[model samples]
Target: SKRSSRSVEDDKEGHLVCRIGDWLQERYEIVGNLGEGTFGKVVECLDHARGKSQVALKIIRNVGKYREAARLEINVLKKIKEKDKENKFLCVLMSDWFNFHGHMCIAFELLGKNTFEFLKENNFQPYPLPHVRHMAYQLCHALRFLHENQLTHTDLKPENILFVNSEFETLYNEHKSCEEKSVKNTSIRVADFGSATFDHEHHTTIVATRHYRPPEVILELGWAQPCDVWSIGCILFEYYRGFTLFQTHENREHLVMMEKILGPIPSHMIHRTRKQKYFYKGGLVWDENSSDGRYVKENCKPLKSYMLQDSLEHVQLFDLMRRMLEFDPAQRITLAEALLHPFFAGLTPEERSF
Candidate 1:
């Protein structure tokens, strides 16, 4: 029988009672809590006979409403693991299912700290250019792999990138004693593919988190693989700048910020949208129109205006960024094209290895 949902107290008691020796899948012993989210808690687990192997067991209650998300996540993980088995940048899933407690559990290879935690320990210093470039190249390869398979990972952020052994050691050697660390030669793994979609059928409206959401998604435009590219661009900027490139308390402010950086939305794109009427007002477009407005306006400035002064030195990088973050989704670079960008020239060895 699958795991059944228990109260929070029961969940806690289960952890306490099973401490150190409880068997999961008749193989893993519960170690401790790794982290928790709105849906579940992830615990660290150790294999009984295989001292070299560790896993994260994510335990989630089987709330009927969340079953779809749970099932979708499992399906997505299966697809990703199958296609990305050789990709060093993607996290590998070991196994998953509904546990004995009526709760869903997914077991994955234990990965190192997420990028967010890594950044916090580093005092939020911008990662070295090479490091950022290396990460970006890997991400591009991962995205390319996904897009080629007609899948879209709607959520892309630092928290989703797991540290590989090499990256973990670099952090340890630079920040702590070698004896304190565990693993080595780790690679980045992209996680949390719940919001992903396969583009086999034509369905238009899927919304992701606002901060990382693409303009096409915001305007209810038909989104495809390019949206993922836009998200990567956002991530690239955030990694180098130590903050989001476009953030606002209000949707209007967010749109304005995006415009200030990427330039005004093209009239052609506006025309193409089904909701264009909502944004076109009396000559001057306000960032926010009334709820009744049919289309959102595209009146922001050109992306070149916001390019940092030092960005001139990295012309290829800047060019790639512009193409990735283009306001007109139709003109944005495809994931395959992005992989071939000149900015990735230095990553030939790593790309070849993957």
Candidate 2:
């Protein structure tokens, strides 16, 4: 066995030493590598099970901890599949799961680039209002289903939301004086259940990516379903502005940005937070003359100022986003309440049913 150890054993990190032509379970043939993450790597594979369709196979590292984590994700994916028989909510469906050698592999319906990836490829152009509206509605419905099932997608961001297809059209933009690409299909599927947690499950002290993280979690108070709403608000803002709303990794700076845009954090929340260093004298201790302060002043603005247009749709959209970004988690808009907001009232009955 030592003579051919190069191909037989996993790497030092427990990632399977696989090649493009490698076979799994004698049915899935690896075609190419899609991407890699700390958990392991995702590879595109040809699945012979369902008329030779392709799937994105997530191969977990061959380690006890990673193996256990995969099981938890599998449970969430199975529950999602059970509840959404019609796939109305747009959560990625796990087509199959199996253990290959020592690795745990999960096959999901192949989806195109995620929202963030698409944006980057399109030169960071912001989406049109109509496209944002359609995608936001589907995203809300997806999160709504998760909440109704007592599950929380603890990590919600543009990278976790994928377009069903990557097809697009490029046309000259008279308003912008440049050629830009626009997605033909706005349909999206929320991907990566790796962090989805049920209400009764253990909640992590820190969850969500930094830019999409909510103040409750950042302040170390606590987090729940409302955290997802905050992330959605940030995501919607990014789609509208072509950049992240909160662009800092530091917690204190993040709070400062929040204050500049959304106004003061409630005294009760500030007093309750274990991170008292972020506040002093009942307000955020910010040095306006500092370099970072200057950045915040330039990049952050009142929530209402973010409205790109005076159109009624823009007005309603910004209003709904303001509610979603409420600093107090208890006062933040819930997915159910958000669906009924006036921004969506103009939708036809059939669109509403969707």
Candidate 3:
């Protein structure tokens, strides 16, 4: 009616979620807001179904562009989730698409702390090798599932990963010690399918977060499922080392990091990028007197500096990481190949059964 025109109807300012405690479709009882995004927010709600359990409802602001994106997400989710029993590594959609108070809503099972939050609680310390392997294996399995289905999760970062909880996620406390702190065998779910899309379609410009982005995206050389694999490599490395494996805000500086460890980027890929000029002259040139020198403007370091070649204890993981962080997307490791790596030979129970 005209009464709600200024309330939640107009979307004049933007599509906003209904106030906390407001009912949706007379089924879900809104409890609180979970987190906010560019268009809308994820709110905590009490669902009358399944014992009236609490769930995380992602609300997309009902604007034209935002609504289109929301529809894309919903389509992707429906395709990936065919049956109830197969959502082991994915955050499953809990309800059908519904509009409430002028907003498009999706309900998902709540999940727990992400890897970044896990690191923060520990003051940014390294995880045990076995524990790290466990997380990496599960993530690889997740990626394998996606790639097998011909999809790409353009954005893969610490924040998009979660541990499934029946209700709202539980907070992580500071770790007491190694024995009790291991996140091994914990179920992980890949969240935020808003950025995911079919692999055959090419994406130009940037697709991923700067820190976890693959070299293919930064160079505008085009991207596919392999780019997602590259992202997993960065995530696994950060989890173990407690820092981004390639930390550079500058595009050329990022390539510098790649060259420092990956040697020269292949000639074919170099020619494909708009930044090709920066690579040929042995470094990137930001300005007349830019100090970065060589392939990139800043004095960047290589992966070998921290993880030595002869480090016996971590040699296995180092080798796997090296292949995953390949400078050339063409030569990058596939999710299936990564799943079969010797680093996970005995560690992955899920893979062995198949």
Candidate 4:
């Protein structure tokens, strides 16, 4: 069912024109595609210049507006690689970029499975607390570094957490040696900067995936760096529960869930958001009637009320989540503060320096 000629519109019906064992740029050979997205397909290529070393190549699909977005993503990646020349938590982007026919392409260090797929291979179960801590610590460190450099990664969901070279057999085969290991073993790199922007710049568009989006983002209350912190909280909870913390898809239903978990939205924030009428009765309190949002459970459950099956630092993590998921960004936890949470107490003093 593969087309012989170049027709990259394959993203539509889930098809691809570039068959396996194809060649790209003569210097690189396309062995297989890793995955596809609205932006493009991420494929594995054999770079002849490096003895056929595997590299992940992202090819932007031919579509309006996608080109600029892809180019901007490249710029953001370049900025991080340049600023933290020695940084480890962020993904690396090659300095060079070019076009293949009309499509824009970028080459990157090939990475393994994303958090979502990896979690699935584990049977939708919660990860070992040690792995959770390791991931959370790295994300906090990465976000802190990003914010310090005046950047904001607006998206932070499971699929964006790329594991190094993805096969778990690597970790299992060396479990004993991995414990004291300092480099890549079981570590994660934060990827996908298409929605990211400079800290001071403002893009009025709604950002972040629905479940991980902050209250400010959902209510059109404007956002900043703390939005990413809120996203981090969501990601951590998903790791704990093995599902989205806020599962509602509709805006109304989503807010209802937030109030249930986080208590009432601050009176001022409700007043600030333009669409507050949908969930509030125009007062400091949420419209108790919001309970009618069919999707929101009639029962009001406290946030973190359920114990994490194997949480190592239960109280500290919950305390951190409460602050990170604050309805009011003004009171939300800062990335720097999150880095110092007692949950990460086990981290080496040197590792905690972030």
Candidate 5:
């Protein structure tokens, strides 16, 4: 159902009153909407100034708190673009910004479905090892660039990692006797900076999504650059296993899963936490006699036990994962160091420089 509108206005919820064929600032044509979230909506717009080039325009809600968050996001994007003038990193690029009526709008290069969507369409099958290696290298490199600029992405999940183009081809797998889809281009860009923080910026107590969150954050020991590294580690495993690493929502349960998979959290960390209720007698306070404990035992296992295969490549990647998933943030492998790990040894020097 298409409706023609004569003027632009905000809805009762402060979202832009989007209408097909509506013009914004007499520049972008509202061709379609990409998606919506609590912050605002992303519109697919045709840029008249750029020969009708299609762009993804994010329109912030008219609410004050969301407006303030959008301000920080824009600031972070500007700083990143400034630092990466040569465009070396794998991150989204913003092209324009403006105030449209009561909403703040930002125009960016349009990208395709994120890794999550891709996986879902693939029936949640794990990506080929080489593809995982390719993605892992780029993900680590992007984190390295952000850390070098003193920025912490704070949120790095499959959903936030988008493909530059989503074209794919179906091919039959001889080993499985089934058709599988593979991406035409594996190039990806990390998107969403609303949670990005600089070293001097105020650090939020809890920054990452629950499954990808690190032990340091759960222990309330304060976090910095290393937190993003922890998130990337979770993402790498997810890519390899075709499922989320930590599938729990409860804090204590999350801790239990981490300890089961990666070994015990340092006793020093357990003693320092503001969340003392989660621990007792120098170990996690768990009721192994209960259903949740049984669920944990069924779902979680030793780190190496997750390997789909025992090939040398799998061994190398798991070793890198172990380093990145270290419970002690200080002991965790830095993204700079991660790029040099044996898992990435296959990259040429020129690709390594990337």
Candidate 6:
């Protein structure tokens, strides 16, 4: 016989009641709507039985595509939870159920706030050094873990990282208009595993967001875990400058912007991917033998203006970020090698314990 499946109502049996606002599916009390996304609404709910703990309940209506995405997200989240048992940066999944609203729901621990909210509250100033370092470390840890498990988080941005506690303002000084802190502790918890996918033996080109996307994805080339590392580099640059490093009005312009910042895509990478029609039409090639040999020189300005004037003490952080965001996904660093990089030197003991 097939395993018996429980609906939200069936799972809530003996828990729900007639009293208004008394219970939700008998255990969680719906507090308020957190936010709405393309797929569904996220609500804040109190788990009455679990010490009145607050959890984010993502409610998905019974639409076919929405259900599939929701189910995929749940499966990925479950795997992440299993693999990240001791990692504090990864969000915790609490439960899943069908609800009275005819929707599939997933409950997750309520993290304090997202990085976007924190930055807005701070008026767009940079975070403290320590806090920035810690955030970079933990997020890299999460990414490393994902890569080790043959997984990739195609979407990585400040919006996807959340604060662990409200009291941990040292990590992000929302009140400070100026003056940088040395050791900030944003205590960022990686959230939103919906876009994550397993890189199981097959190649994918339908990965990543435009501004945060890797060059391989842009070129429709085969991609793997390294594509996600590119997104991480974009996130780091954006966090430091409060703006996207590859900002452009169009896709072509975006590639030009990247070339300007990171230097031109090598001839070998161009030739390797030349079999694709888009590369020729997109004007991604540089006439290396000509006077205007560099792609940036021919089509765009250099990125010296966008360079950070900060100390090189954190140069390793930027170096790792740059390598991870390499135009050729094949050249991107592996998660294991990234873990051993100097940027993560401070986390060696903690990593060993994990």
Top-TM-score structure, candidate number: 5
> What is the per-residue lDDT of model 3 for residues 34-89, given as tens digits with 9 covering 90 to 100?
77768688888888866788888888887778888888888778877763355465
TM-score of each: 0.80, 0.94, 0.83, 0.85, 0.94, 0.78
Give the clashing pairs for model 6: 8-98, 15-26, 130-182, 130-183, 130-184, 131-183, 131-184, 131-185, 171-185, 171-186
Q: What clash count goes with each model?
A: 22, 0, 7, 2, 0, 10
Which 10 residues in a row give candidate 2 its minimum summed lDDT? Answer: 1-10
Stretches off by above 4 angstroms in model 1 are 1-20, 49-52, 84-91, 166-186, 201-204, 274-278, 281-284, 287-313, 348-354
On residues 52-108, what C-alpha lDDT tens digit does candidate 1 reach at each position? 378888776556555557777888788877776764545456565555454667888
Clashes counted in candidate 4 amount to 2
Error of 1 at 16 (Å): 11
List candidate 2 stretches off by more than 4 Å: 1-9, 348-354
Please give the RMSD to the true structure for each candidate, in Å. Answer: 6.0, 2.5, 4.5, 5.3, 2.7, 6.9
Residues 124-205 of candidate 5: C-alpha lDDT, one tens digit per residue: 8778888788889999888899899889999889999998888999878897678878988777899999899989988878
Q: What is the lDDT of residue 273 in candidate 6?
A: 68
- True-structure lDDT of candidate 4: 0.75
lDDT of 6 by residue, 1-354 (tens): 111223233222222112224345667777776776666667788887788888887777556676677677878888877776765535555465554444567888777767766666666665544455566777777788777787778888787788776443234345544543232335667777877888763556566667787777766667778877788777776777666676544455566667777877766766666445436643474355544344335555454354455566366667777777677777787766776787766553543333
Name the candidate, 2 or 6, with the larger TM-score value.
2
How many clashes (backbone atoms < 3 Å, residues ≥3 apart in a chain or on different chains) does model 5 have?
0
Q: Residue by residue across 1-354, what tens digits does model 2's lDDT show? A: 111334556889999877888878868888989888899999999988677899999999999999998899999999999999987888998889988767889999888888998899888889988888888888899999999999999899998999889889997888889988899878899988888999998898999999999999998888999999999999999998888999996888899999989998999998898888877798899788888988998888888987789999999889989999999999999999988888887665655676
Residue 25, candidate 1: alpha-carbon lDDT: 59
Regions of model 5 farther than 4 Å from truth? 1-6, 173-177, 348-354
> How much is the lDDT of residue 14 in candidate 4?
35
Q: Candidate 4's residue-wise lDDT over 1-354, tens digit each?
A: 232345444545333356677766666778887898867788888888788898888887766578778788888888888887666656555745666665677888888888888777765665655667777888888888888988888988999888775655323325333322122455678888888899667677599889899888888988889999999999888887677788766776677788778887777877777775664375433344554554466553788675654345777777878888999888899989987788888665554453
What C-alpha lDDT values do all the predictions have?
0.66, 0.88, 0.72, 0.75, 0.88, 0.65
Which ranking of candidates, highest TM-score first? Answer: 5, 2, 4, 3, 1, 6
